[PDB]
Amino acid sequence: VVIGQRCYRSPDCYSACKKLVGKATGKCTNGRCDC
């Protein structure tokens, strides 16, 4: 899901996404995570 874990690069959430659902997914949306 989209989270307020601010981004730098496209991922800048992958790690979280992996530990949240299981895989390094999601992108950089409005400088916030879109997983």
Side-chain angles (χ1 to χ4, degrees):
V1 191
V2 57
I3 75 168
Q5 179 177 60
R6 61 181 62 120
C7 154
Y8 193 118
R9 315 178 177 112
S10 293
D12 203 295
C13 193
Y14 270 9
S15 299
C17 282
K18 191 180 295 301
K19 59 76 65 178
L20 283 173
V21 65
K23 298 177 64 179
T25 176
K27 64 282 191 66
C28 188
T29 305
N30 199 300
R32 302 157 179 115
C33 185
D34 190 83
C35 201

